[PDB]
Symmetry: D2
Subunit: 327 residues, 4 copies
C-alpha cells in the first residue's frame, strides 16, 4: 500500500511482550517468549495505519537494559532512519527503564523522522492488557507527517510524552508515565493525534551528540541522598573508576556533611558530580557554595544518561553544565 | 488565656528559620541564625490561636538531620505530650527530610495529642515567604480538638498531609508536599480546617514501636536502581555492617542481574532487603521469585525509617513484611 | 461455593456495556444491546472471587440518567442489601454521570455492605477495553470483608474512589477518575486491595437522608459562572419552579453583579442557592456578604445531589449549610 | 530607583538603558486586595489599591526592568466583561506598537484571568511578552503571594527569551500558556495548572527555565483582530448534568445568543433534553460548541451529535474562542477548524 507510511517495529522486550498462564497474573510473568511478529499479528489494525516490518533487536526485561545495548539500539535506529524506505520507528520496551533508553536516543538519533517508544504495564496475556492499544497509538504517531522533528516520544495510555520530561511516576498503574510540570507533547483520542507542545530543548538533529561507532560509554553511578547517608558509598564508586556520579539528592540536590566530603573526594580524583533530586520533579538550581554541577530539571535516571554522553565529548565542567541547561 | 490550647513550638531549624541579606536570595541563605522566639514574634496572630511556648531543640538544615537526633526528638515529644499542660506540639523543620523525621515520630509518639511538622520552601527573609502562614496553620491544626488521633501531620501551603503518605515531590516549589494517590488528611482555607480523610494504617498510640530508652538505631542504607547499577555497592554496604538495605528500584522494585547478586549476598549475611521504587508513587507488590521484602506504598526514605524501627523489634522477615503492609 | 461472597451485579448501561463493529470505533458504538450476563461471561474469573448474580436494572448511556431513575436505583440497592443472601452490590454505569448516581446512593443506602460503582471509558468491543479488569476489581472490592462501612465506592483503572470525592476529571482518558485533593480510598494492585483512607464524612448508615418512600425529588438546576453571565438564566430557573440553584462559580463561588441580582431574585422566591466552583477542586469558604450558602468541597454535580436531598429534610439555611460541611 | 513624574507630561522611564521597559497595566484582583488584618483572606476590599502601591511593595522589580504603572481598571475579575476585555486587548496592542515598550505585565483577579488572558492570546498582534499576574491572597495577607508573583511576571516580561510564546499567566513560580492554564482550585496558591499540557516554564532561584512552546496559533499568527470593534457576539454557557432542562436553551435563544458553549457530561455528551435544546438553537442560527464540565481533555468529533466540539478547550476558553470566531464567520466548518488550531 504505497499510500501508507513504512514503519519498523524494533522490539527490545518488556511487559508488552510478557506472557503468563492466566489473565489475572499481572506480576510473576515471563519476558523473552513473545516475538515482534506475534505482537503485530495480535493487532492487525496496525496494518491499516502503516506498512509495518518487525525486527527483533532483543527480548529482555528493561531492568536488565545496559548502556552498551542502548548504544547499539541508537546505532541501529540511526541506520534504519537513514533509509528512504523507512518513515519512522516504533520501539517496544519495558516500562522500568524506557525513560533512560528513550532519552539516550533523544540525544543521539540524527533524524527528524519519528522514533516512538511504546510499552505496557500489563502483560500481553492480561485481562484488559494495555499493550495492543499502546502499540496501535505508537504506530499512528510514528506514521503521521505532523510527528516529525518532535524529539523521541514515549506513547502509553493515549499520551505522547517527550523522552526529556516523561518518567515512570508509579510502580504499578497504567497511567504511570507523566511529566507533572511539563505535560505531554500530545494525546491520541478517537484515533486522532492532538499535538499540544513542542519541547524547548535541543535534541536529535540539533543535538551535538553523535555516538555512531563508539562501542562503550563512561561509567556513571547514582547515589541516593537521605538522613545518615554514608561517605563509604562515594569511596566505593571512586575505587571502581566511575567517571561521573549523579546524586539523587535531598530536596534541591542538598548534601549532608557525608555527601559533601564524598563529592569533594570524587572531584579531586577527576569524577564529575551532578546534583539531581530524589523528589521526582523540578529544578536543582545552581549554588556556587556546593560542590558539583546541577541537574536543572533532569531526574537522576535522565541526568546519568546526559552525563555519560557529556563525558564522551568533554571534561570541561562549564560545557557539561551548559548541556544540563540546554538538553 | 485559659480558653486557649497550650502548644509547644519545638524548633529544629530548616529554611523556615533561614535568613538572607535580601528578599530575592531564595538560595545561599543562612540556617542556624533564627531562634524559635523570632519565628513566633513574626506571627503574633499565633497567640490568638494558642498559648505558645518556644523550645529550641536544634537549628540545622534538615539534610544534616540524623537518626540519633530524630530518636531524641521522638523522646522529647513523648515527654512533652505526657504533660497535662501540653495539648499539642508543632515542630519546625527543614523540608528536605521532614518526611523522614515526621514518619519516625508517626511510628513512635505514644499520644493522640496532635504532632504537626511545619516547614517553609522560602527563607523567613524572602519576598512572599511561606513560613509565617505555614506556622499559623500548623498552630491552628495542633490546637484543634478535631485534630486528635490523626497520626503525625505535615502542614504547608494550606494542606495537612499524613506523615505516612506525604513526600516532597518537587525540588523547589511551594506546593511540593503532595500524596498523589492518597491525598491530604485535610486543608486549611479561610482560617478553617476541613478534614477529608483518616489514614487506614497503624500509628502513634496503636503502634508497637517504642524507642523510649533506645540510644541508637540499626544501620540501613538506600541503593538506587538504574541501567548498569553496580553489584559493588551491595558489597560495600555488607562490608560496612548494614542491618538493612532499602532498594529504590526500577519500576515495581525490579532488580537487574547485578542487583539480584548483590541482594542474595546481603541476605546470606543476615541483611534485610526492602524493595521500594524510585518512581515516586504506588505499590511494590510481593513476588516470591525476587529477593527481599516489598515496601508496599512506602517510598525509599519512608521504607528506611520503618525498616530501622522494625529491626529494633525483630529479624523475622514475615513480621517485618507485615509491618510494611500495616504501618 | 459456600466460601465465596454473594455479589449482585446490577447493570444500568454505560460504555462498559457498549458494542461497536470494530475494535477502534470510539463513536456511534451502541449502548442498550449488551446485557449483564454478557459482561459477566467476558470475565469468567469473577466467578472465582464471588457467587455473582446479574440483574438488568436499565441499559442506558448515563448522560440520560435522571433523578427519578437514580431514586429507583437507590431503592433497589436498599432492597438487595436488606437480604441475608446478598453480601454486596456492583453497579455497572456510564462514566459521564456515575459521580452523581454514586453520591446519591452514598447518602441514601442504609447498609454497611459494599456498594461499588464500576464503569469503562472504552466499549466492551474495543482493543484494550478497560471494562473487564474494572469489573473484576469492582467484584474483588465488593466481596472483601475489609470493604464494609467505607461509603459508596467508584472503581476504575486499579483505583477505589469515594463517591463524595471522586469525579470524572478528563473527557476521554482511562485514568479520568481522580480526587486531586482527597486521593483514593484504596488501590487494587496484583489482585490485592490496599486501603489507604477512610473518608471523614457522614454517609450510608449515619446519614439522615432516606428516600425509600419517595417517588420524586425537588427540582435543582446548575448555572455556570463566567464573564458576562446573564441574569435571565436565573429568571428562567425561577419561572420553571426550581427549589434550588447550584452555581458553578468563578473561583471560590464568586458572583458578578448580574449573578447577584439573579440569586437575590431566587432567594426572594424561596429558592436555595448553593455557591460551588467551576474550577474542579477545593473549598468555597463562607462569606456572609454574598448571597446563598457555600458548597464546601462539593463540585457542582455533587452539590446538586446533596441540595436535592437537603430539601427533603429542611428549608433552614443553617441546617443545609451544616449538611454541606458534614456530608 | 525613583519615579520621575513631570507636570502635564506624566512619568519617565528610568534611564537604565541596560534594562527592558515594562508597563504594569493594572485591572484589579485580590493582588490589589486590602483588609484590616493579615488573616482576613475573605471579606477584603478590591478597588482601593493602585498599581504604584503594588510596585512600591516590591521595589526589587526596578532592578529587573524600568517599570511604568498604568491603572486600566480596579475591579474583582468576577465582574470583568467582554467589552472591558476588548478595550484591554486594544490598549495592549497600542502599548506594544511603541518602540519604548518591551513588554506588558497585566495585574488581574484569578477568577477570570484565564478568560481575559486567552482573549488577548488570540488578539494581541505582537511577539513582545504579555504576562498576566494575579494573587490568591490579598496584599495585606500573611505570606501574601502577589509580591513574588509580580516580581516573577516582570522577570518573564523583560526576558528576550520570552518573546513569541503567546500570552502567559504567572503565579507560584509557574509560567502557563493562556490557551492551557486554568484555575483548578477555588482557594489554593498553586491553583493554576494545565494537567495535560504542563507549564511553558518555571521561575526558580531568579532564573527562567523554558520547557515548552505551545503548538497552536496565537498572537502574530492569529486571524483574530478586534481593533476597531466596539461590540462582540453574545455567547452563553449551559451546564450538562442529570435532569438538565431544555428551558435554559429556550431562554438563551429568546435573548439573542449567537453561540452556546455546553459544559457537557464527559466528552460533551448530551441528554435527550439538551439535544432538543441544541437542535432548536441551531434552527435559529446559534452555533453550539460541545465542551466538557470534567476539567481536562478532548471532546472528539461525533457527526451523530449536534453542534461542533471544543477540542481540549474548557468551557470558559471555548466561549472566548467562539465569541471571537463569530466576529469573523458563521461557517461551522471554519469555526470547527479554529477549535482544532487555536
Ligand atoms: N519489568 C518490566 C516492566 C514493564 O515493562 O512493565 C520491564 O521493564 O521490562
Ligand atoms: N535545605 C533546607 C530546605 C528547606 O527547609 O526548604 C532544609 O531542609 O533544611
Ligand atoms: N456516554 C457514556 C460514556 C462512558 O460510559 O464512558 C456513558 O456515560 O454512559
Ligand atoms: N475575586 C478575586 C479573586 C482573586 O483575585 O484571587 C478576583 O478574581 O478578582
Amino acid at each position: 500500500d504505497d499510500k501508507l507510511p513504512n514503519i519498523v517495529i524494533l522490539a527490545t522486550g518488556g511487559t508488552i511482550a510478557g506472557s503468563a498462564a492466566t489473565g489475572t497474573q499481572t506480576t510473576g510473568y515471563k519476558i523473552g517468549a513473545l516475538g515482534v511478529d506475534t505482537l503485530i499479528n495480535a493487532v492487525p489494525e496496525v496494518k491499516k495505519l502503516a506498512n509495518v516490518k518487525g525486527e527483533q533487536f532483543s527480548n529482555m526485561a528493561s531492568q536488565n537494559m545496559t548502556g552498551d545495548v542502548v548504544l547499539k539500539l541508537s546505532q541501529r535506529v540511526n541506520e534504519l532512519l537513514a533509509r528512504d524506505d523507512v518513515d519512522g520507528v516504533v520501539i517496544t520496551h519495558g516500562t522500568d527503564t524506557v525513560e533512560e533508553s528513550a532519552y539516550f536516543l533523544h540525544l543521539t538519533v540524527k533524524s527528524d523522522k519519528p522514533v516512538v517508544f511504546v510499552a505496557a504495564m500489563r502483560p500481553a496475556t492480561a485481562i484488559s492488557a494495555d499493550g495492543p492499544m499502546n502499540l496501535l497509538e505508537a504506530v499512528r504517531v510514528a506514521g503521521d507527517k505532523q510527528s516529525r522533528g518532535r524529539g523521541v516520544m514515549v506513547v502509553l495510555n493515549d499520551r505522547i510524552g517527550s523522552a526529556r520530561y516523561i518518567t515512570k511516576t508509579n510502580a504499578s498503574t497504567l497511567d504511570t508515565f507523566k511529566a507533572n510540570e511539563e505535560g505531554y507533547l500530545g494525546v491520541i483520542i478517537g484515533n486522532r493525534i492532538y499535538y499540544q507542545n513542542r519541547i524547548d530543548k535541543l535534541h536529535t538533529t540539533r543535538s551535538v551528540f553523535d555516538v555512531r561507532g563508539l562501542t562503550s560509554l563512561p561509567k556513571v553511578d547514582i547515589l541516593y541522598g537521605y538522613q545518615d547517608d554514608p561517605e563509604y558509598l562515594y569511596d566505593a564508586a571512586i575505587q571502581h573508576g566511575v567517571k561521573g556520579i549523579v546524586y539523587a539528592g535531598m530536596g534541591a540536590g542538598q548534601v549532608s556533611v557525608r555527601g559533601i566530603a564524598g563529592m569533594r573526594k570524587a572531584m579531586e580524583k577527576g569524577v564529575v558530580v551532578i546534583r539531581s533530586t530524589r523528589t521526582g520533579n523540578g529544578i536543582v538550581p545552581p549554588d556556587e557554595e556546593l560542590p558539583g554541577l546541577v541537574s536543572d530539571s533532569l531526574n537522576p535516571a535522565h541526568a546519568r544518561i546526559l552525563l555519560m554522553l557529556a563525558l564522551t565529548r568533554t571534561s570541561d565542567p562549564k560545557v557539561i553544565q551548559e548541556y544540563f541547561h540546554t538538553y
